Amino acid sequence: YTMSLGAENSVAYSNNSIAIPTNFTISVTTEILPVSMTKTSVDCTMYICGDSTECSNLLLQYGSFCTQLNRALTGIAVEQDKNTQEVFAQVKQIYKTPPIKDFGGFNFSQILPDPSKPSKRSFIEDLLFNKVTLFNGLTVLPPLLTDEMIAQYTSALLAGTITSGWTFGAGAALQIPFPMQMAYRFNGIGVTQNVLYENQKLIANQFNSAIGKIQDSLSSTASALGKLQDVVNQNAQALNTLVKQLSSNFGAISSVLNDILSRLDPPEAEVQIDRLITGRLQSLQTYVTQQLIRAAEIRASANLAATKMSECVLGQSKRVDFCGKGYHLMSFPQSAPHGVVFLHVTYVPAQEKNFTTAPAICHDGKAHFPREGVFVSNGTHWFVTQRNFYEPQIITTDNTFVSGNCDVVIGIVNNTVYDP
Amino acid sequence: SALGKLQDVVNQNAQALNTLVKQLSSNFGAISSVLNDILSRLDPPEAEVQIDRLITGRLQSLQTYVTQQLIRAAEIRASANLAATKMSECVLGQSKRVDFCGKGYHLMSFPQSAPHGVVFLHVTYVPAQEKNFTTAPAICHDGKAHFPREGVFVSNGTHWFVTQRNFYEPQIITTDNTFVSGNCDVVIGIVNNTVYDP
Amino acid sequence: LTGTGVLTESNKKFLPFQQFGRDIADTTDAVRILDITPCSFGGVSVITPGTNTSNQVAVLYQDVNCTEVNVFQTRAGCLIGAEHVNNSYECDIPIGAGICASYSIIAYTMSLGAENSVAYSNNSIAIPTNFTISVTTEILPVSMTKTSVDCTMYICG
Amino acid sequence: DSTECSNLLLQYGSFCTQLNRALTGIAVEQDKNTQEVFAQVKQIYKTPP
Ligand SMILES: *[C@@H]1O[C@H](CO)[C@@H](O)[C@H](O)[C@H]1NC(C)=O
Ligand SMILES: *[C@@H]1O[C@H](CO)[C@@H](O)[C@H](O)[C@H]1NC(C)=O
Ligand SMILES: *[C@@H]1O[C@H](CO)[C@@H](O)[C@H](O)[C@H]1NC(C)=O
Ligand SMILES: *[C@@H]1O[C@H](CO)[C@@H](O)[C@H](O)[C@H]1NC(C)=O
Ligand SMILES: *[C@@H]1O[C@H](CO)[C@@H](O)[C@H](O)[C@H]1NC(C)=O
Ligand SMILES: *[C@@H]1O[C@H](CO)[C@@H](O)[C@H](O)[C@H]1NC(C)=O
Ligand SMILES: *[C@@H]1O[C@H](CO)[C@@H](O)[C@H](O)[C@H]1NC(C)=O
Ligand SMILES: *[C@@H]1O[C@H](CO)[C@@H](O)[C@H](O)[C@H]1NC(C)=O
Ligand SMILES: *[C@@H]1O[C@H](CO)[C@@H](O)[C@H](O)[C@H]1NC(C)=O
Numbered sequence: 140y141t142m143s144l145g146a147e148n149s150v151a152y153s154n155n156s157i158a159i160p161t162n163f164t165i166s167v168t169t170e171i172l173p174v175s176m177t178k179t180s181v182d183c184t185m186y187i188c189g190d191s192t193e194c195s196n197l198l199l200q201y202g203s204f205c206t207q208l209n210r211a212l213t214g215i216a217v218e219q220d221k222n223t224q225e226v227f228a229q230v231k232q233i234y235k236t237p238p239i240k241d242f243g244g245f246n247f248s249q250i251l252p253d254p255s256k257p258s259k260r261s262f263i264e265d266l267l268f269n270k271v272t273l274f275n276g277l278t279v280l281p282p283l284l285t286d287e288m289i290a291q292y293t294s295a296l297l298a299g300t301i302t303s304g305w306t307f308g309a310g311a312a313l314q315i316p317f318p319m320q321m322a323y324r325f326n327g328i329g330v331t332q333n334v335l336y337e338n339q340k341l342i343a344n345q346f347n348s349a350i351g352k353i354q355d356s357l358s359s360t361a362s363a364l365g366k367l368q369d370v371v372n373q374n375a376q377a378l379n380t381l382v383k384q385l386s387s388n389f390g391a392i393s394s395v396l397n398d399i400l401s402r403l404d405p406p407e408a409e410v411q412i413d414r415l416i417t418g419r420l421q422s423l424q425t426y427v428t429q430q431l432i433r434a435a436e437i438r439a440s441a442n443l444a445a446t447k448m449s450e451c452v453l454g455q456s457k458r459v460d461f462c463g464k465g466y467h468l469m470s471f472p473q474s475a476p477h478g479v480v481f482l483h484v485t486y487v488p489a490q491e492k493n494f495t496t497a498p499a500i501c502h503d504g505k506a507h508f509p510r511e512g513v514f515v516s517n518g519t520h521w522f523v524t525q526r527n528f529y530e531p532q533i534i535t536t537d538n539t540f541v542s543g544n545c546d547v548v549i550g551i552v553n554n555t556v557y558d559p
Numbered sequence: 560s561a562l563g564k565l566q567d568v569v570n571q572n573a574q575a576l577n578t579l580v581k582q583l584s585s586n587f588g589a590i591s592s593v594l595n596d597i598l599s600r601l602d603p604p605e606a607e608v609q610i611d612r613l614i615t616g617r618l619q620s621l622q623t624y625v626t627q628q629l630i631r632a633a634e635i636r637a638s639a640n641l642a643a644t645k646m647s648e649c650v651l652g653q654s655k656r657v658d659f660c661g662k663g664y665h666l667m668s669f670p671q672s673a674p675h676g677v678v679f680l681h682v683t684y685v686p687a688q689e690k691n692f693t694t695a696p697a698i699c700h701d702g703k704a705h706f707p708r709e710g711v712f713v714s715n716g717t718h719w720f721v722t723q724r725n726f727y728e729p730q731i732i733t734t735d736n737t738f739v740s741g742n743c744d745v746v747i748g749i750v751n752n753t754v755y756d757p
Numbered sequence: 758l759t760g761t762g763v764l765t766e767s768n769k770k771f772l773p774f775q776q777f778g779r780d781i782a783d784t785t786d787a788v789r790i791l792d793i794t795p796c797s798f799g800g801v802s803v804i805t806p807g808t809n810t811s812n813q814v815a816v817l818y819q820d821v822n823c824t825e826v827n828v829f830q831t832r833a834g835c836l837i838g839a840e841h842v843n844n845s846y847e848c849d850i851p852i853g854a855g856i857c858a859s860y861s862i863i864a865y866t867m868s869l870g871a872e873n874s875v876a877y878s879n880n881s882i883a884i885p886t887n888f889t890i891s892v893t894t895e896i897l898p899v900s901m902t903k904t905s906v907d908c909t910m911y912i913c914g
Numbered sequence: 915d916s917t918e919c920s921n922l923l924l925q926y927g928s929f930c931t932q933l934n935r936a937l938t939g940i941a942v943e944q945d946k947n948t949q950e951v952f953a954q955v956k957q958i959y960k961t962p963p
């Protein structure tokens with residue numbers, strides 16, 4: 140068929156009509172970002188020749204490409220370590236969650252470290268690790284930061300986020316009861332603190348339900364970590380392709396160097412060695428170039444991940460869709476085998492209602508504009524509310540300001556303004 | 560080693576050029592690394608065979624160097640895009656992004672030149688001398704719940720004040736800097752207090 | 758068929774018509790039944806606190822269980838010449854697998870940072886009473902040397 | 915379409931698969947770039963008459 144771009148709808152746009160939500164949704168979405176890849180070291184002399192002195196002699200008379208390839212691979216490994224350090228080792232102190240989990244009904248046991256010691260990983264981290272499944276001079280250099288240390292970094296970041304908000308990302312951590320932290324975050328997205336202080340129980344229940352939906356999605360729905368799996372698969376495919384190319388004839392009489400040496404005279408043996416060296420060296424050049432390109436891509440992804448950690452996790456971001464769809468509230472990091480997972484907690488408007496607006500109010504031959512919010516009328520009664528939530532208030536001189544007469548404003552209506 | 564990044568960049572470039580020069584004087588499987596001796600010693604068929612071999616080797620070395628230079632140029636372009644962005648919203652303005660231009664609340668930045676790069680001196684605000692106070696989500700007065708317009712309600716042990724979030728400026732609770740948004744029967748943590756009406 | 762490696766008793770079962778056995782990469786693995794496993798090999802790294810600070814060095818064999826050949830064993834391989842201390846310091850020379858070295862040469866596990874527990878409780882906040890103006894230096898390369906190579910002159914001369 | 919090329923390339927290796935995989939990955943990446951840049955919404959809104 141021809142793919143459909145999405146649902147087709149027409150929005151009722153009028154010069155005196157607005158739609159304001161009367162309810163909200165706390166939605167938790169998951170974002171996957173690769174942070175690093177496997178550190179592979181290739182010994183060029185061992186790969187091309189395989190501990191044969193004569194092939195090594197012909198290689199060293201050929202040139203110094205081996206040093207260049209080793210330097211490139213070493214630089215790739217150090218870049219991977221730096222990527223891991225920059226994404227994870229950001230906070231200079233390891234914060235510990237207090238034993239009394241009094242977060243005003245906001246459950247966090249699914250992302251907090253489990254006291255039962257499952258390698259000091261949260262239950263979500265355990266599912267993330269379990270969901271992804273991971274001789275010729277080819278070695279795998281272990282990462283500098285172990286999985287437990289990465290988990291401890293994530294736990295410290297998460298504990299600092301809960302117990303201090305964004306204060307610990309800008310200096311010394313300052314304790315906050317985590318309810319006024321949510322009130323501050325609501326203030327950041329344009330919602331007054333009264334919404335939280337009226338619907339705290341509902342907000343906590345919705346947040347726990349969203350975490351549970353993430354629980355079910357990670358438990359049942361597979362292929363949720365497609366990016367990390369794709370990175371691992373590409374690296375494994377490239378390595379396997381190099382391994383397969385090790386046993387190519389390249390125009391020689393045999394792909395086994397030892398067989399050539401034990402069968403053929405030194406002049407013809409060395410010309411066959413030259414052919415094999417040319418082929419294997421070209422294959423290694425191709426592999427190193429692809430590895431460098433992939434390392435650059437992974438470095439860009441890790442820079443993006445570090446920016447997301449610093450902006451979404453250590454604070455509240457006003458950037459649209461940078462930390463999840465909707466008005467971003469907070470983010471929680473979770474460790475992944477070769478990357479990171481961001482649980483973005485966001486505010487989504489819902490349950491909308493029609494209203495009639497007016498730019499200003501003409502009262503006593505004067506134009507009154509709202510300080511913050513918008514003028515809305517249901518039926519024949521006029522009120523002022525806030526943009527992101529329907530909280531009507533009586534129009535009063537305190538929350539409105541006067542600017543000129545009501546002759547130049549287009550769309551102004553006649554209404555009374557209460558003077559207290 | 561304060562300017563270690565620029566030093567690393569110039570060292571990498573110098574190493575690449577030095578490696579190219581060294582590879583120029585490599586045998587590449589021929590009889591000698593010099594071409595004039597090949598001309599003066601061999602007959603035209605063998606001479607052109609050795610010249611072809613040397614051309615192939617040097618062409619491979621030059622392509623390797625060019626590819627490395629292209630990768631490094633892409634990385635430097637990314638770094639320069641980052642630098643231009645940092646200049647754009649940290650020198651030409653104030654950035655609200657966390658840790659983009661310094662550890663702490665960024666105030667302003669100053670750019671300075673460098674032999675092959677730029678250096679940003681980020682002036683940032685860092686809180687210090689933290690003190691512990693007793694808080695409440697709202698204040699109950701005349702059967703009504705009062706919330707601060709901006710800031711937070713704190714208590715020093717006996718009296719309740721309202722201050723700002725990033726600094727301690729305690730002020731008496733007043734109807735001017737507080738707003739009423741309901742009663743005291745729904746707010747968790749409500750604390751009874753009086754609000755001065757001027 | 759000539760080669761270098763270690764002959765080992767094989768638990769795999771061959772067939773009467775089968776003589777050689779090759780695993781992935783089409784390389785010889787088992788020969789008639791004896792398994793061929795090449796002897797241990799790997800890289801050699803040197804850990805030094807710099808020539809001026811000291812003349813002492815430690816040798817790290819990566820991916821080699823060097824019990825066959827001050828000895829420490831880590832997931833990154835084995836280390837010779839360093840005394841294992843059970844303290845926790847900031848990493849100075851990154852060895853790998855969470856293990857670093859510092860100056861006698863000691864090897865330890867990385868200290869992730871100062872550990873403190875925020876005094877988190879309801880109706881309690883921490884508010885600063887003073888400010889600090891901090892200037893932080895950040896360095897970003899903007900450009901590199903523009904080099905032009907004439908291929909005709911370089912290759913031929 | 916010469917059999918000698920196939921004969922001399924089957925022993926040369928599997929570079930053709932590498933190049934095809936690289937080009938396929940590039941093509942998939944461009945499709946993803948367009949998809950990410952242009953499909954920021956899932957509803958096709960229409961301007962009122
Ligand atoms: C908002 O939705 C929740 C259920 O999601 C409901 O319990 C609540 O009453 C709604 N709010 C209003 C004002 O109707
Ligand atoms: C949080 O959820 C876990 C299991 O989902 C439960 O054991 C725990 O009691 C919950 N905490 C609160 C405060 O409800
Ligand atoms: C309210 O708005 C919706 C969509 O914005 C529209 O379909 C509906 O007709 C409006 N209702 C009234 C009474 O205008
Ligand atoms: C409009 O809504 C307000 C709610 O504040 C209510 O007091 C008023 O009666 C409503 N007017 C009409 C005409 O429904
Ligand atoms: C909206 O447009 C209509 C034309 O259909 C006009 O009669 C009306 O005065 C306009 N109202 C405002 C507030 O602009
Ligand atoms: C508002 O009232 C004034 C005075 O009664 C009148 O001149 C004007 O036409 C009214 N405006 C509207 C929009 O009804
Ligand atoms: C009191 O303040 C200190 C520093 O000012 C802070 O680190 C601590 O969390 C606070 N709470 C205590 C000691 O209960
Ligand atoms: C709190 O401060 C007020 C005035 O700033 C003072 O009257 C009172 O004695 C103080 N109480 C304590 C316990 O420090
Ligand atoms: C704080 O929590 C304790 C129990 O942990 C409770 O007794 C107290 O009433 C709470 N105070 C406020 C202001 O929420």
Ligand SMILES: *[C@@H]1O[C@H](CO)[C@@H](O)[C@H](O)[C@H]1NC(C)=O
Nearest residue numbers: 699701702743749750751752
């Ligand atoms: C606040 O005062 C009202 C009446 O004056 C009383 O009913 C209520 O229990 C008081 N609350 C507290 C926390 O003292």
Ligand SMILES: *[C@@H]1O[C@H](CO)[C@@H](O)[C@H](O)[C@H]1NC(C)=O
Nearest residue numbers: 806807808809810811812813
């Ligand atoms: C170490 O540094 C010193 C002074 O900085 C210098 O003289 C020496 O050459 C360096 N290395 C050696 C060989 O000690």
Ligand SMILES: *[C@@H]1O[C@H](CO)[C@@H](O)[C@H](O)[C@H]1NC(C)=O
Nearest residue numbers: 821822823824830831832834
């Ligand atoms: C080395 O081998 C011994 C026994 O052969 C084993 O106990 C030890 O775990 C190995 N060391 C490592 C981690 O390579």
Ligand SMILES: *[C@@H]1O[C@H](CO)[C@@H](O)[C@H](O)[C@H]1NC(C)=O
Nearest residue numbers: 829840841842843844864865
């Ligand atoms: C740490 O290591 C030392 C020496 O390796 C050993 O005595 C013991 O396992 C640990 N010592 C202490 C005091 O924990």
Ligand SMILES: *[C@@H]1O[C@H](CO)[C@@H](O)[C@H](O)[C@H]1NC(C)=O
Nearest residue numbers: 687688885886887888889890
């Ligand atoms: C704040 O620190 C400065 C020095 O940085 C000092 O002069 C001043 O007395 C301090 N202020 C307070 C209120 O302690």
